[PDB]
Amino acid sequence: TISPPEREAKAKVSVDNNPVPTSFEKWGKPGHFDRTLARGPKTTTWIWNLHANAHDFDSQTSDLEDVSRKIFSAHFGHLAVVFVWLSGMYFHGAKFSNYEGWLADPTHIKPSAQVVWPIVGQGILNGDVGGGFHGIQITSGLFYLWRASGFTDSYQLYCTAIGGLVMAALMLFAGWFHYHVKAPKLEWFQNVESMMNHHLAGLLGLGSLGWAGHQIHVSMPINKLLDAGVAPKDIPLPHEFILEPSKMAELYPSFAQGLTPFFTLNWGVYSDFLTFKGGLNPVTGGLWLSDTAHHHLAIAVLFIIAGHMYRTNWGIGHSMKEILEAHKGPFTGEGHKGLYEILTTSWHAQLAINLALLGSLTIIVAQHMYAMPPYPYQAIDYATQLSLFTHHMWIGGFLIVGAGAHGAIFMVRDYDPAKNVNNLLDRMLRHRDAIISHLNWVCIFLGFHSFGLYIHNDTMRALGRPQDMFSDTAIQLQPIFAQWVQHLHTLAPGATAPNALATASYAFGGETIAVAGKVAMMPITLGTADFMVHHIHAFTIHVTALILLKGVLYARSSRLVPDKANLGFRFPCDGPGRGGTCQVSGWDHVFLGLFWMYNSLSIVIFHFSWKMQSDVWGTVSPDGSVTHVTLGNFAQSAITINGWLRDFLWAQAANVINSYGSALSAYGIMFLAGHFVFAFSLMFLFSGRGYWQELIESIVWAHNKLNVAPAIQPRALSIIQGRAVGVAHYLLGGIVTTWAFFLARSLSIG
Amino acid sequence: MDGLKSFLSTAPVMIMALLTFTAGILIEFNRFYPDLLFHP
Amino acid sequence: SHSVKIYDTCIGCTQCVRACPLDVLEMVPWDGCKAAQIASSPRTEDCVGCKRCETACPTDFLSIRVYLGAETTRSMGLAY
Amino acid sequence: WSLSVGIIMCLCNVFAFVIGYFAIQKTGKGKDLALPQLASKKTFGLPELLATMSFGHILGAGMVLGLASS
Amino acid sequence: WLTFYWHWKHLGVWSGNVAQFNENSTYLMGWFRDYLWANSAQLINGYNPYGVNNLSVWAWMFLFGHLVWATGFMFLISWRGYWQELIETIVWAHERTPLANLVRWKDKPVALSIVQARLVGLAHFTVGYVLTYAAFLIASTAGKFG
Amino acid sequence: TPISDSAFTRTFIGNLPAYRKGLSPILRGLEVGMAHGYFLIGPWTLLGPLRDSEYQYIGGLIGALALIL
Ligand code: CLA
Ligand code: CLA
Ligand code: CLA
Ligand SMILES: CCCCCCCCCCCCCCCC(=O)OC[C@H](COP(=O)(O)OC[C@@H](O)CO)OC(=O)CCCCCCCCCCCCCCC
Ligand SMILES: CC1=C(C/C=C(\C)CCC[C@H](C)CCC[C@H](C)CCCC(C)C)C(=O)c2ccccc2C1=O
Ligand SMILES: CC1=C(C/C=C(\C)CCC[C@H](C)CCC[C@H](C)CCCC(C)C)C(=O)c2ccccc2C1=O
Ligand SMILES: [Ca+2]
Ligand SMILES: [Cl-]
Question: Quick one: which residues bind [4Fe-4S] cluster (chain A)?
């Protein structure tokens, strides 16, 4: 390949000059990365096993220095993919949307960023969203982001898409470069102190720094005019603000003083745009951008300071090895000793932490965006609110189970017992039965004392006994702690937050902000119907944690299988003996935990969707009264399973089945299609391959009868692959059904 | 080189190229002459 | 207890014994194959039936067969 | 600004200087020279010196803005 | 499928509305909506927060059949070894719990075999398949015509 | 572990019949009974089917005499 100079300046840089040459001969050789697959396909299973192990780099090569260089370029390729996708959205907003038609009258028109080609009758899918535009009403909330970012013309989105494509090309190029030209050694990687310093000070610090600078120079001075009532064509450009710094000095009183006070510790003077108002914007229904710029500046300073704790080359700083070897108490013996070496060698050990934290943070993103809407006019778009919330729920739900998968992978592949002698991990491996049986008991308890309540309420209301129910009008189960913290957050601006003018969110308690004719956010009164559903959520999460934990604490061995570590991570069983050893591996435990993550989030999203429609969302009268959609029956009807079957499912599913003949017909189609895929998964999940191979035998005889049998002998899916296709189709059908239902229901509420 | 000519002729690439070509055929035919429940 | 048989199609490759995790199978000198040995199952009392032997058989269809039977504490793999 | 430097900012700089001259593990191990003899700015390497110069700005901000608004 | 066919066409014949069936049974949404969703209104309204009528027992049996049918899915999807390990954990828990190891068991508790697993799952599936459809067929019929 | 065996637990684990020192099979479950119907009366004190009638202290008694059986 090419040959650059060196690119270093007394650093820990260490690369290899052209390790892997550039050629196309390996492209025509599928499955070359595996020794077991390179000899050619002899059965059709050879094909499936090709994809099942395409990215598993441990089974391919054993050298870690090769695997890390593969992973780096893989990340670069993923970033190229992501930039391509994002340029897609910017280009569809520039040339296939009505962002300009929506920004003018945002309260009398609906966001849309897709145009369906009129053919074979599908042109009916172009719904009249308002202003003469015909297309699919989007729910990802891109117009709100582009308004909060300062976009006002189509050429801006066009140039954004062009820059996204350029960055995609750059990431794709860097991937090839860091594996075919100068691939880094191990000396460049294992600097976790240095990597943490750089990822805190530079990435998360300077990032929010520059974005706050953007907002102060683009977002704030344009959204201030947008919220006033000025037309977008009369609003100046972002660079006209720097070309004329006086126009910025005047638009904010603090800006009328200069830059020196900031350097001379005169922060309090910049209170005219670095505000702490809180609450929402009465014009758009979203968070104040003057607060978000200040917030990003604070986060920037905090992260840059955090990026100066660990030791690099100038002696100062910490070594995480020291911190881990120091922490040891009388309860855990040696404590964190050996954990630095665990997380500096095993990639799966690192991924089992990163996936868990990233999924939890995605869930936090959903839970924080829904209650403190940060984008303009997103709290009025109930469809966009619900869609962002549920999508960031599902992403995190998957990324969490990924952690429980890669932990078992680390256990089977990278756990060295000689390296873990009486530390945290080794001692946790000792009393596996204690933790697992205690979590078993906890899950049983949470199952009886959360779901049994619903069963008891259904049986009482069915028997005609109202005074024997767990309702707000009988044996009340009032949540005292949540209401107390709600009241705490309500009294914040006048006690434990004198500088704060409004509460963090109006869900805890306070005023009722509403834009146009719909409400943005109001206090979410918590009663019995909320206590019961919260305990349901806790129970489902507990069972999911139990499953995904026994998947890791027993991937090595067990009283049933003492040599399980030999069998690997992914294996169906160990024979029908011992009464039956089916589904004992960590892979099978993840296969089971997928279902329970789905079942937990299925109740979470339904709790959200019904509580919002019943006790929050609703049209506001000009006199002041607020009438909710489902007439506030959640506190009085969500306490029984029949309530959810009738007043939630049967009642709110009518929008989906009656969608034929309209622009929402595709949603009914996909509703039935997910109902189809769900049941299609049951064929795999309830059967076994021993029947399907015997049937393939007869079909092979039939093919050889006419002499039409492929040299690639057909073999039914492996047991593991059967289970994998089953769970994949189960999740796909269920999520497609719920997606279609939620979108058709949220678009049909005005 | 032939290394890429063999990759462009693999099973998935060819089975998606044929599907794209047949999709184009069917889509254009039902663009110019749609709504053919039967033969007149 | 389970029943373990070995048929004359066995080539005596010790693979089923190298795969057995409970020392159920052995190898006795025979006169049928080049290796002059055949699989043996003296300690059927320790056979759980995990089919690890049958999985490790090379002949056209199995030469060693396991037939599950009356399960006991030892065959059930009970460790408690 | 008339005395924000010497009373706090220089004070916090020298405070961090003392606590870093006494608390930092690796001081003179830095890349910089620290050749000339100074009071506390070049007695040890400028890695340590700049470390306390940054931490003293942290302390000075936290104290000046903590006094009374601005 | 056969019973959906019979019940829907006979609803059309009984209400004199053979047109509904003859004009909606050609596409599946007609079944999913004009039959399942349409004829369930009284069924799910056997017991409400407003009152309780004679369909309440059927409204309870409908959800009961759903519960049993979904219970079968556990035996049919998850297989034995997981449950044998989860049972061994509980065995250890009991044989170490003070005031409880003195409660020894003659029958050594084991997980359900694979054959028994499939049998129990199919039995729960069949119970929740028959009872649910019966609670629908009787309740939705004893309302518009009973 | 301290919870499994400590100073108080080493004696209290060994203080109820099947571990208690020299207790006869007649008193084989004194506590195992003195602690049953006394705490079974709790959930029936303010929550039972007959919690809002005139026999607030009767349904619990009969239910305990059946559950102990
Ligand atoms: C035209 C440029 C080019 C060429 C000729 C090669 C050639 C080769 N690469 Mg390579 N690579 C490239 C670019 C290229 N690469 C880039 C840009 C990246 C960064 C992502 C990588 C990262 C990379 C890694 C990590 C590895 C290779 C390996 C290899 C060798 C085997 C590849 C194989 O298995 O078959 C061909 C494989 C495919 C055709 C995959 C199909 C494409 C997949 C399904 C998705 C495409 C994602 C893509 C990278 C980004 C999307 C683009 C965006 C517009 C959406 C082979 C000689 C492997 C090796 O050295 O063997 C041990 C190895 O591990 N490459
Ligand atoms: C950034 C996160 C991340 C990364 C880097 C990895 C990386 C890896 N995982 Mg992993 N995993 C993750 C997250 C991640 N995982 C999560 C979140 C889960 C929970 C669902 C899992 C669960 C999981 C399991 C159970 C297994 C792995 C395995 C693996 C290894 C092999 C990958 C493979 O099988 O090849 C390529 C992957 C595939 C061919 C999968 C294709 C099938 C997909 C899922 C279909 C999806 C359909 C599409 C998205 C939507 C439908 C549209 C349709 C109509 C077209 C590999 C190193 C395997 C292993 O052996 O570990 C060593 C293994 O068995 N992972
Ligand atoms: C909705 C669920 C569902 C569906 C669709 C099927 C479908 C089928 N089952 Mg089945 N089954 C199910 C549930 C289901 N089963 C359950 C729960 C069980 C109990 C475990 C069984 C047990 C069972 C047994 C024992 C047998 C079958 C058999 C069959 C096949 C009969 C052939 C046929 O019907 O003609 C035509 C096929 C179809 C109508 C289905 C194909 C539909 C797709 C969408 C066609 C288009 C292909 C698609 C575009 C692929 C591209 C995907 C791309 C997007 C990635 C058929 C494919 C028999 C068999 O194997 O046939 C010989 C067989 O013996 N099933
Ligand atoms: C919602 C909560 C309100 C309800 C109240 C519930 C009280 C919870 C009990 C107190 C916390 C117990 C953990 C600290 C106790 C603690 O960690 O002490 C510390 C101890 C080890 O500390 P060392 O002395 O070894 O410290 C050295 C370390 O650096 C490592 O070497 O850890 C253990 O005790 C191991 C036993 C864990 C098993 C007990 C955990 C119980 C699981 C349930 C926990 C519920 C938490 C809910 C939070 C949402
Ligand atoms: C049906 C079935 C099979 C047989 C399944 C087979 C043979 C899979 C059929 C795959 C066909 C040949 C490919 C069609 C699906 C493609 C992946 C879709 C790609 C379409 C693009 C080309 C457009 C099993 O092997 C099995 C194993 C364990 C438990 C249950 C079952 C089970 O139920
Ligand atoms: C839960 C579960 C278990 C554990 C189940 C156990 C230990 C059974 C516990 C049930 C007890 C006995 C109560 C059941 C109550 C019945 C209604 C009683 C019917 C008996 C008649 C005589 C009346 C398995 O062993 C298993 C095996 C293979 C696949 C899936 C599973 C599975 O899902
Ligand atoms: Ca009562
Ligand atoms: Cl109800």
Answer: 573, 582
- The answer to whether residues A299 and A279 touch, using CB atoms and an 8 Å cutoff, is no
Can you tell me the distance from the alpha carbon of A512 to that of A493, in angstroms, rounded to the nearest whole number? 17
- Give the residue carrying structure tokens 């949307």: A97
Q: Which atom of ligand 4 is nearest to the CA of A327?
A: 29
Q: Decide: A249 and A261 in contact? Cβ < 8 Å.
A: no
Long-range CB contacts (within 8 A, 24+) of A511-516: A511/A279, A512/A620, A512/A626, A513/A279, A513/A280, A513/A282, A513/A285, A513/A379, A514/A285, A514/A620, A514/A626, A515/A107, A515/A282, A515/A283, A515/A284, A515/A285, A515/A377, A515/A379, A515/A380, A516/A107, A516/A108, A516/A380
Name residue C64's beta-bridge partners.
Answer: C6
- Quickly tell me which residue has 């028997």 as its tokens: A463
**Cross-chain residue pair A580–E37, CB shorter than 8 Å:** no
Q: Tokens 């989860």: give the residue.
A: E86
Half-sphere exposure of residue A512, counting CA atoms within 13 Å on the CB side? 20
Residues ≥6 apart with Cβ < 8 Å to A381: A110, A111, A139, A141, A144
* Separation CA A355–CA A368 (nearest Å): 20
- Note whether F52 contacts A475, CB cutoff 8 Å: no
CA distance A305 to A206: 11
User: Are A138 and A109 spatial neighbours (Cβ–Cβ below 8 Å)?
Assistant: no
Q: Which residues pair with C29 in a beta bridge?
A: C37
- The resolution in Å comes to 4.0
Nearest CA to ligand 6 atom 19: E120
Mark residue A109 as left, alpha or beta (left: phi above 0; alpha: psi -120 to 50; beta: remaining).
beta
**All chains having 3 or more CB pairs closer than 8 angstroms to chain B:** A
In CATH, which of 3.40.50.12100, 1.20.1130.10, 3.40.50.300, 3.40.190.10 is domain A1-750?
1.20.1130.10
Spell out which residues of chain E touch residue F18, defining contact as CB-CB under 8 Å: 99, 102
Residue A256 CA to ligand 3 center (angstroms) comes to: 72
Q: Which of A140, A163, A165, A160 is nearest to A150 (CA)?
A: A160
Residue E56 backbone zone (phi > 0: left; psi -120 to 50: alpha; other: beta): alpha
The answer to whether A264 and D4 are in contact (CB under 8 A) is yes
CA of A59 to the centre of ligand 1 (A): 18
Residue type, A233: K
Token digits for A282? 């009465």
Contacts (Cβ under 8 Å, ≥6 apart) of F1? none
Instruction: State the structure-solving technique.
Output: X-ray
Query: Closest Cα partner for A543 from E8, E132, E86?
Result: E86
Closest-CA distance, A12 to chain D, in angstroms, reads 14
Range of the domain at D39: 1-70
F32 HSE (CA, 13 A, CB side): 14
Touching check for B3 and chain A: CB below 8 Å? Answer: yes
CA distance C43 to C23: 8
Q: For A308, how many CA atoms within 13 A lie in the half-sphere containing its CB?
A: 14
Fold of domain C1-80: Alpha-Beta Plaits (3.30.70)
Just give the CATH number of B1-40.
1.20.5.510
For residues A202 and A185, what is the distance between their CA atoms, to the nearest angstrom?
23
Which phi-psi region, left, alpha or beta, contains residue A618 (left: φ > 0; alpha: ψ -120 to 50)?
left
Q: Which residues contact A579 (CB under 8 A, 6 or more apart)?
A: C71, C76, C77, E80, E84, E110, E111, E113
Query: Measured between alpha carbons, how far is A188 from A65 in angstroms, rounded to an integer?
Result: 11
Q: What's the A714 CA to ligand 3 centre distance in angstroms?
A: 18
Tell me the sheet residues that pair with C67. C3
- The answer to whether A468 contacts chain F (CB < 8 Å) is yes
Atom of ligand 1 nearest to the CA of A20: 60
Q: Nearest to residue A74, comparing CAs of A50, A54, A89, A49?
A: A54
